[PDB]
Amino acid sequence: VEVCPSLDIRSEVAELRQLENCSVVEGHLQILLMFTATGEDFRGLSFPRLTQVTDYLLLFRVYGLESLRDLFPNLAVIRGTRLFLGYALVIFEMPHLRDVALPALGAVLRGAVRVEKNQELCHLSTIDWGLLQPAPGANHIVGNKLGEECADVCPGVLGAAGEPCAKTTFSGHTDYRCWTSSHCQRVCPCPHGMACTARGECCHTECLGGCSQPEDPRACVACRHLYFQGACLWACPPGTYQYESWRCVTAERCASLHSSTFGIHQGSCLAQCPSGFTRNSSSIFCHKCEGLCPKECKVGTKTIDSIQAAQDLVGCTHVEGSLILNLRQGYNLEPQLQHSLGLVETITGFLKIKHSFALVSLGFFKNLKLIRGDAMVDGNYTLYVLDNQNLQQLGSWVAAGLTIPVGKIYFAFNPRLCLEHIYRLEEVTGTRGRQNKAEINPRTNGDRAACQTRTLRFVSNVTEADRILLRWERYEPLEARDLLSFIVYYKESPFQNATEHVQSWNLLDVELPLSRTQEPGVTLASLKPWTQYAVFVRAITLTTEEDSPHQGAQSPIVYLRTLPAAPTVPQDVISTSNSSSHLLVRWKPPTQRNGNLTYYLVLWQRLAEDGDLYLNDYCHRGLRLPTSNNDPRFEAQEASFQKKFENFLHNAITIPIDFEIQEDKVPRERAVLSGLRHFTEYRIDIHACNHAAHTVGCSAATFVFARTMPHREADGIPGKVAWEASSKNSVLLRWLEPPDPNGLILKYEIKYRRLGEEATVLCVSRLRYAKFGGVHLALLPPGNYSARVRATSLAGNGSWTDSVAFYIL
Amino acid sequence: VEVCPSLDIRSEVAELRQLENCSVVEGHLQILLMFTATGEDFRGLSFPRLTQVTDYLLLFRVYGLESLRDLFPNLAVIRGTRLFLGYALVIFEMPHLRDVALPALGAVLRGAVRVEKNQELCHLSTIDWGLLQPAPGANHIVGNKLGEECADVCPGVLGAAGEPCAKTTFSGHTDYRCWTSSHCQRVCPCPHGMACTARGECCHTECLGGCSQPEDPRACVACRHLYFQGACLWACPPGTYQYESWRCVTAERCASLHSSTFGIHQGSCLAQCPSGFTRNSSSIFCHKCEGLCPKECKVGTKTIDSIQAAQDLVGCTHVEGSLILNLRQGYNLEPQLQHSLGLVETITGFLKIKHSFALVSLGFFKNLKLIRGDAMVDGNYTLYVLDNQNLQQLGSWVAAGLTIPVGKIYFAFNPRLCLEHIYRLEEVTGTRGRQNKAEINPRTNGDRAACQTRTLRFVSNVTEADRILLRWERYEPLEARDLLSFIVYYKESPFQNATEHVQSWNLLDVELPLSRTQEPGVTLASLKPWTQYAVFVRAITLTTEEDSPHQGAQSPIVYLRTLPAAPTVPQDVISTSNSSSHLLVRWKPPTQRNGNLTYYLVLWQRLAEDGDLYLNDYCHRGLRLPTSNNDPRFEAQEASFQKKFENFLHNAITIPIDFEIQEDKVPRERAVLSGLRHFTEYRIDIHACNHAAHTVGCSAATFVFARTMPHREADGIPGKVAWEASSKNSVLLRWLEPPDPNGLILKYEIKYRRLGEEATVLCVSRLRYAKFGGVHLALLPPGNYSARVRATSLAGNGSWTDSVAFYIL
C-alpha cells in the first residue's frame, strides 16, 4: 500500500518509529549502530503491519535485540531486486541476538543469506533455506555460536513446549525444522512456490507467502509476479506499466512517481533508459538511438585538476556550462583525458586552460564542435589558453569543425605553441576582426617551438666494441644569429620499436663546429657489446628575432648495433666420474654472452702424480689417500680482491686454435670425456665461444680437477710369488710389480705365519722392495711356513695372491 | 744495482725475458695470464741475478709452472713498501704448481702472504712464516690441496733424500721446516733479524737475507735499513737523501730520477709533497704552506656533464685552461659541485655554461677571483652563460672579488635570471663599454623571474577535521596587465623544519578574484585529522612589458594543525580467566590515533544463559558443554564486504558518558575485571579515547565474549537426601537444589544398588525432579538398598553426596 522508500535507522530506538505507517518497503531496510538500546526498549516495540521488503534487509550492531519475533512478526516476502553485495539478508555483529525468528517469512526470491559473527546467536542449523531460497547453496553462515554448543530445540522431538511440525533435509540431515522454541517453520504439503493457509491447503499459484482464501488471486497477501489494485497478475494490464519489478502503475502515475529522465521502454517505467535508448520531449518512450546516446551534463564552472576530476564528465556529449582545465602534476594525460573528455560536442560556456604544464597537446577534444560561450570570462573571452609551458599540437578539432558564435579567443604565454596553429584556429573559427593586438601577439606565444619540422639524415656511422661514432649533415642556422646546438637522444632498445621525445632516453648536447666541412658528429661511449641502441638527434635552434621561421629539424630513430666481444667465463662447473674411463662435465652459460653463443671449447690435460709420493717410506706417517670424484649431479676486502682479479681476467682472451692437452668443441652445456686413464687426475678448461674467427677470441678458462674411478683389479700381482731359502734361517720372497696400478704403488704388506699359530704381517716400502727385488725373512723357528703377499696402491688395498710354502731347517 | 721499475708480464714466455738485466726491482713484479706455456719452456728459464723485490710479488694463472726454485733461486728480501691490498706475496689460481720453493728468501718486512685456490700446490703447512714475516698471523692460506692429502716431506725425518735441517713450531706444531724435498729453510741459531752464512754464524745486524763475510756491513747482500754505495746504513749520509725508503741518492740524483713536482721534505725524495707542503721554483724543499695548498691543474677545454666529470677538478686552485659546464640531467647539484668546484681562484681560459637545466644557482664558485681569458670563445667572449632555464642567484662571487682583464661577457636566454644580478656583475667586473646591445639585452634574460621578493602575510586561518581554509592579503598586480595567480604549496610535515621551493610539496593554483574585498583564499581538503601541515604561497606575476619591475611575492612557511577526531577501534582483543572471579583483557592501540591517546573506556555486561537450556530434557541428545576461556596469553568480495562495514563503522561514535553494564577507564592497554560471578559469560566493549569532551567522542566498540572459570564446589548438594517408603515397592528420594550452580543445573544422576550386586544409575531431568521434588524407584526385589545422588551443571559433573539406606518388604 504505502510506498515506504528505502530507509536507514541508526543510533536511536525512537528513530525506529518511522515504520508505523509502513506496509511494504520499496527499497532496502537498514538497522545499524544501536549503542544506547536495551532489551526493555525492544520488548515493547513491534511493527506488525510490515509484510514485504523489496531490496534487502540489513542488521548491524543493534544492542539489546534478543529476537526479531516481535519486530517483524508478519514479514513474509523479500524480493531481493537490489542486493547488498549479493546478499538479501545480512545480520552482522549482533550482540544479544539469540534466534532469527521470522515465523511468517515465506520466501526470498533472489539473493544469498549472510549471518556472520554473532557469538550469541544460534538456532540456525535447525532450519532449511530450500523452501525459502530457490538456491540455498549460496548462504554464508559462519562465525556464529557453535552448532553443538546450544540445543536447537523445536516444539516436537523431546518434551518440548507443545505441538510438533514437519521435518526436512537440507544437507543430508533429515531433521525437524524450527524457527524458535515456540514457533517453527510453516511447511505444507504441495509443490514448491505455492503459499498455503492455516488449514494447510496451498493457495493460488500467483499467491506468495500466505493467503486468506484458497484458489483466489485477490486473496494473496503478496503477489508473486506482479501486483495491481489488490490483484496478482503475470503481467500488467494494457492500460498500465511495470514499476520496481513488483507493481503496476499507469503511465501518468509512474511519471509522477519519478518527479524528467525517466522512461517506460519495454514495459518498465525506469529512472533512465539504458544504453542506446533516450527521449527528449515526446511521449515517455525510450526509442532507439541513432548512433550514440546524447547524454547531457550540467556543471557551472567545473575546474579540472587531475584525471579523476575529469572522470566525472565521462560519457557527456553536451556540456551545460564552462570548463577550466589546470593539469600541472600529471604526465602523459592525453590518453586518459581522451578516455574521459572527447565525446563533448557543445559547450555552452567558456573554455579556459591555465598552467597546464602536463598538456602536450589538445587532442582529447576530437568531437568538440561548438563553444557557444553563454557564460564567458571577464574581458569578453571565450577561449582562454594561458601559461602552457609545453603545448605544441593544439589538437585536430579544427578545419571547419569549430564555430564560436560570440566572444574572443586569447592565447598568451604558450612558448611551445607556434603562431601558425593559432592563426589556423582563428581562420577556421571565422572570427578575426573581433580581437586586436596584445591578445595573440608574439613575444609570449609562438617563440621557441618549431612549425615546419625538417629532416636531418645521418651521414656516417662507426661501431666499436663499446663506442659508437655518428655524423649527420650540417644544418645551417638559416637566420644569421640563430644560436643552435644539437641534442642526441640515445637509449638501449632490444627491439626495433621506440617512441620519440620520451625519462628513458639519454640526452647529450653537441655544439656544431664553425666551418664548412667536419659535420657535427658525436661519440657515444660506455656501451655494452652486442647491444642494439636507438639513436636520434634534434636541433634546438633557439632565436630571439621578431619575424622569423623557426623551422626546427630532427632525425628519424635509427637503430645501431655494436661489435661483439669475448664472452664471460662459464659458471658453476661440476665434474663427476661414472666409470673408470669416463668423465662427465656440466656448467652454466656466461653471465654476459657478448654475442650469439655458438659452442664451448673444452680442453683436458692429464696430470702426473707428484714426485713426493714416489721416494719416501709409507709404512710410517700415513696419509689420507685421494678419492675419486663423486659430486652428486645425477668481506669488503675479499670482495675488492675478487673484483681486482676479475678486472685482471677481463683482458684475458683465448685464440680458438704424461702431458698433452686434448681439445674438443661442444654445442650444449655438458660434455662427456672418454678414453681416459684409470685413477688419473685431469684438468678441464671450459671457454664459452661465439663468432671469434675475426673477434678478439673465446673466453677465459674455468678449469676444474677431476679424478677418474679406480680400476677394480689394477692392483693384481702378475705371476706367482717365488721363494729362495738360505742356510741362515733367512728366506727371500720375490714378486713382480703390477704393470698398470692406480697411479702408483705405495707399500707391500706381506702376511706370513707358521702352520698352527697366529698370523704375522710386515710392511715394506718401494725402495726396500727394489733393493733386493723382494722381501727377506730371518730369525724364525725351524719348520714349514706359509706366506702371502699383497700390493697397495693410491686407490687403496689390493687383492691377496696365492700363498707360497717354504721350509727352514 | 739496476733500477728495474715495476713490471707486469702476460701471455708470453718470451715476455718473461725482461729480467736478464735486472738485479733489484724498484716496484712490484706481476706475472699473470700465461696460457700458452708448458713445463718445457720454464724448465730451461732462470733469473739467478734477481735478489730483491720492493713492493710485492704476484703470480696468477701461469700454466706449466711447476716450481719457483728455478725462476727466483736468489730472491731473498721482499720489502713490501707498497702492498697489493695488504698482501706482499700473492699466488692465485696457479695450475701445475707443486711447491713455492723460495730457498734463498730471507724475510718479508711488511705485508701478508696470500696463497689461495691452487688445487695442485701443497708443501706449505711444513713451513713457518715466523722467521720470514714479523707477523705471520695475517697470512691467508686456504683453498689449496688438502694438508693430509700430500706428504710434506723434508730431507730429514724418514728415509728422505739426505741431510736434515732444523725444526720449529708455528701454531703448536713443533715440526721440521722444509721448502721442497731437496732444499729446506735456512735456519741458523741467533737472535731474530740477523742474516747468516754457510758457516752458520749470523752476520752484521744491518745485513738482511745473507752475507759473504761475518761482522761486515759492506758484505751484506741486501741492506736492511738503507743502502748507499755498497754499504748498509741506518740513515743516509748528510750529502744524500732517501729514495723509495730503501736507497740513498744525492739531491741532484733524485731530482734526475723524477725527471717538477718532486720534493725532498723530511729526508725523503718523494714524487709530491703531502698536504700542507709545496714548492714552486726554489731549492727542492717542501716548505710549510701558508693556509692552503695551491694545487695547479691543467685542462685544455674540460667539458663537465655530471658530478663525476667535475670530480676530476677536486682540490684544484689555479685552473690552466677553460671550463664548459653543461648539467641538464642532475638535481640539487649545488652541494656536490661546491664539494668538487669552489677552490678555483684563477681560470686562464674562458668560462661557459650551456643548457644547465639543473643549475639553480652559481654559488659553487665561492673562491673564484680571476678569469684571465687567455683562450676565449669565438666572437671575443670570456663569460658565456647561455640557455639556463632556471638560474636565479648567480652566486656570491661578486662585489670586487672578480676581475676580467680581457674579453666580454654574454648572457642570453636565461629566463629566471633577472637583469639586476647581471648588471651588478658587470659593474663589479669593471668592464661596461666593451660590450653592446643584443648581448645582455632583455627579451631573453631577465623576464619571468623576480628581483625584489616581497612578503605576503596570511590574514585568516580556519582548521577543520579534514579541511583547512586560508586567506592572505590581496596583492595588486602593480602594472595594469600583469596577469597573475597564486600557487599554494602544502605538505605534511610532522616537525617544524621544512625547505621552500622543494617533489615533496603539493601544488595548487588559485586565481585571485576581481574585487577589492574577499581576499583570494584557498580550501585544502582531504587531510588526515590531527596532522601538522606546512603551507606557503607564491605569486607568479608573469608579464610581457619591456621595462617593468617583476617584484614577485611569496609567504613564509606556516605550520597549521587540523582538529582531532575520534580514533579507530582497538585491535586484537584477547580475554582470559585466571580465576573463578577475575578476567584479564589485553589489546593493541588503534591504527589511527587521530589525536593524543588518553585512555581506554572498558564496559562489561553480564550475559544471562539462554532459555533454551532451561526447558528441555538432557538425558537424551547430549550437547557440547561450554568451556571457560583459556586463550594462551601469559577474497575480493570478502574484502569489499569488510570495507563496506568499516565505512559503516567510520561514522560510529560513542559519547563518554542480570543485565547491567559496568564501565571503567584504563590508561594502559590492559585491564583487570574483578567481582564477577562464577562461570558466567561477560561481553567486553573497549573504546580507545582522547580529548573527547568537546570532540565527536570516543571510538567504536570491539566487544569480545569471556567466560569465567567454574567454581570447584558450586555443584555441592546442600543438606542430606531424604527418603520416603511406600507399600507398593516404590520409594521417593528428595534432595534440595544447589543454591548457586555454575550457570544452571542440567540433570541429576542417581546411583542406587542392592547390597551385594552391581550398581545401577538413573538420569532425571529438571522438570521430572520438580514434578515431585525428587525421584521415584519402583519394581525392585524386597531387601535393604542404598542410593546416592549427584548434581550436574553446565560446568560438568558435580560431587557425590552421602548415601541413604532404605528397606522394601
Swiss-Prot record, chains A, B:
Residue intervals on the Extracellular side: 658-809
Gene giving rise to this polypeptide: INSRR
Name of this protein: Insulin receptor-related protein alpha chain
Domain of life of the native organism: Eukaryota
Carbohydrate-modified residues: 21, 280, 380, 461, 497, 578, 596, 784, 797
Residues covered by the Fibronectin type-III domain: 452-565, 569-639, 717-809
Cystines in this chain: 188-196, 190-202, 203-211, 207-220, 223-232, 236-248, 254-269, 273-286, 289-293, 619-763
